[PDB]
């Protein structure tokens, strides 16, 4: 499965001037485009090397698209004040996220579209993609405004057709990058504590996509230290799980790695 | 491509 997601953000700036609009495009676990109004150069720019050579029609469309969204979001911000009874003193956030997910077959599986005020669920497009549901008592006016103007129909066409159509295009554009699977480099490192305590770590480094599984056995559930999947900085990801080991008896514990890049799930132990 | 339209709240 592959998905085309977009993360749009607008932040009101009291005294600093016009609000700041920033939108980022994601083909799978890869950021491929971005837009920013803070620059004097306010255009949609390539953030993946496969987008670097695309032509100016595409860059013209996406700039005018993002430009228009920024204009509306600016107004939406002054409007959102009236609802929550706010002043020109506080800096507030307006976030919009949308995306389509393909199936294991190759065609549309699901789609989503959510709006949020100050990082809190505001208005959400229904699962059916036919209408809107307010997740806040102040969104009620914005909802029974959208539902009456058949707004969900515009978003339905993009999510079901456009989003999907273009996603295939981008996946083909960078087959050698996106569709190529990088399996994780795995190693177990030992960091002792005292006479009894000791720490054993399972390092999963250089993997794509970020969806991975790392667990310690004897099924050892009680107090496992696991870190969030962090970006390596080169496009791949990193993750590790640590366990409290009673000194000497190390072979009693086993680490299991599960990722799409591996044909069979790999198990590991520390080499002294 | 990002959505061509948006919501006027």
């Amino acid at each position, epitope marked *: 499965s592959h998905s085309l997601k977009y993360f749009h953000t607008s932040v009101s700036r009291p005294g600093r001037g016009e609000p700041r609009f920033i939108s980022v495009g994601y083909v799978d676990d890869t950021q491929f485009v971005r837009f920013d109004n803070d620059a004097a150069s306010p255009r949609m720019v390539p953030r993946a090397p496969w987008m670097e050579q695309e032509g100016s029609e595409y860059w013209d469309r996406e700039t005018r698209s993002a430009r228009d969204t920024a*204009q509306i979001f600016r107004v*939406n911000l002054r409007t959102l004040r009236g609802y929550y009874n706010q002043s020109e003193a506080g800096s507030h956030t307006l976030q919009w996220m949308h995306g389509c997910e393909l199936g294991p077959d190759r065609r549309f599986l699901r789609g989503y579209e959510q709006f949020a005020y100050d990082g809190k669920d505001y208005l959400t497009l229904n699962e059916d993609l036919r209408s809107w549901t307010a997740v806040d008592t102040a969104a009620q006016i914005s909802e029974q405004k959208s539902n*009456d103007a058949s707004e969900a129909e515009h978003q339905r*066409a993009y999510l079901e057709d456009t989003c999907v159509e273009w996603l295939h295009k981008y996946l083909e554009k960078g087959k050698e990058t996106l569709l190529h699977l990088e399996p994780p480099k795995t190693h177990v490192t030992h960091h002792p504590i005292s006479d009894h305590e000791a720490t054993l770590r399972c390092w999963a480094l250089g993997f794509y996509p970020a969806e991975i599984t790392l667990t310690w056995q004897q099924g050892h559930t009680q107090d496992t230290e696991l870190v969030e999947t962090r970006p390596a900085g080169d496009g791949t990801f990193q993750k590790w799980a640590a366990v409290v080991v009673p000194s000497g008896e190390e072979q009693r514990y086993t680490c299991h790695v599960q990722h799409e890049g591996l044909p069979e799930p790999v198990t590991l132990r520390w080499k002294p | 491509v990002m959505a061509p339209r948006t919501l006027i709240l």
Partner: T-cell receptor
Amino acid sequence: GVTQTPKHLITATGQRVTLRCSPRSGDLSVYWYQQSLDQGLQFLIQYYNGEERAKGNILERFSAQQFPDLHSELNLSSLELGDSALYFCASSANPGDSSNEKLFFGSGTQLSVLE
Amino acid sequence: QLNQSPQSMFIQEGEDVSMNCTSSSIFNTWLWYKQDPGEGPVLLIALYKAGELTSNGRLTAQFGITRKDSFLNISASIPSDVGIYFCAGQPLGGSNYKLTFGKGTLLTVNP
């Protein structure tokens, strides 16, 4: 709510003109249309909350702008004999209103370009 | 791009008139205007949903399940209806505040 200035205007070939718009109170968008004598209304330019939103095949000699208050102006240079038309002003985009997309027109400016 | 046929209708008072509007793309909102010589276009009916038919007395407009057609009917035709009828629409997938117009249909009501 939409009010246009002037009503009837008459100049000569090669000169310049300025046309005013006072949109509805609360409406952020302004549109400019060129309805010829029978040749249907053709879109020129649209502004939204001060900035230019959409353009529609303007001759380059035709200028325009929207101010901090939602007022607008349409500037016409090297006025040519062919430009003799009924220029209309439209207003919409009041996030206060529920009918938003709905457009409202003002009684157009009758412009004539003689030699 | 929108197209209104038949461009002109020479009719007799008391009769009923139908007006068609066909587009070259799927639409989401339909707007019906009337323009009197010199006067600015004034809104008659606005359609938002695919199946709905909406009215203002003698005037009735339809959306059309096709999403590329809209109709305008005038019940009793007093010679007051003499005017140009413009059809407008919100093309599906278009950005906010983008709406197309037609050349309009001229209605002539004979006494």
